[PDB]
Amino acid sequence: DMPVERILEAELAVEPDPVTNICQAADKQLFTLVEWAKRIPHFSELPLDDQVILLRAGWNELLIASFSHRSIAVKDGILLATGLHVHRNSAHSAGVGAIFDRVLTELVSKMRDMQMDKTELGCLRAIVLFNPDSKGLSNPAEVEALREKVYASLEAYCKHKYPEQPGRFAKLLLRLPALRSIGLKCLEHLFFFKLIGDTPIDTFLMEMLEAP
């Protein structure tokens, strides 16, 4: 069983140079991400190795969806978990304007325009978490089954909460390819920051950047 009420509870439970501040917030949220995942139905029941695989595979997308939704009422910028607001101009002045603008135009603005709610956000993150294509999974079919239960619950929720919007479910799912692309580009940047060594990178963030 995959009740949307439980997913919502998981979201509510974890709610609290420019690049250096952004990376600091990322490290901080990685700890919170683990607590979030444990609250998602059936995640803690999967074998430990698979739990590790799913988190290492989706942490970028999971964190991006979270700060993007948290920034829906912010104009031309994002709100970091540390409480700091980062404006588009600041990101541009730091050399990461292109990827920052993609987050604003492809995610933040779209979430705002459709008024994506916390339940929907939680379900999309749960779908991202339960990625059956993650390499190394001991039982990909089990993870696929969990993903299917999540999107079945999400579709039911959308039709009941927003009956006047027949395309809302599809619209929500169609933000996932953009999230995937942005997450990959973000990872590339992080690898570069690590390579250059000019940006402080905390221990957990650093660990996520280590080889499998």
Binding site: F31, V34, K38, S44, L48, Q51, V52, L55, R56, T203, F204, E207, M208, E210, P212
Partner: peptide, 11 residues
């Protein structure tokens, strides 16, 4: 490997 992550998932 994945030292921190394993410890945190320990619960």
């Amino acid at each position: 490997k994945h030292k921190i992550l394993h410890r945190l998932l320990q619960d």
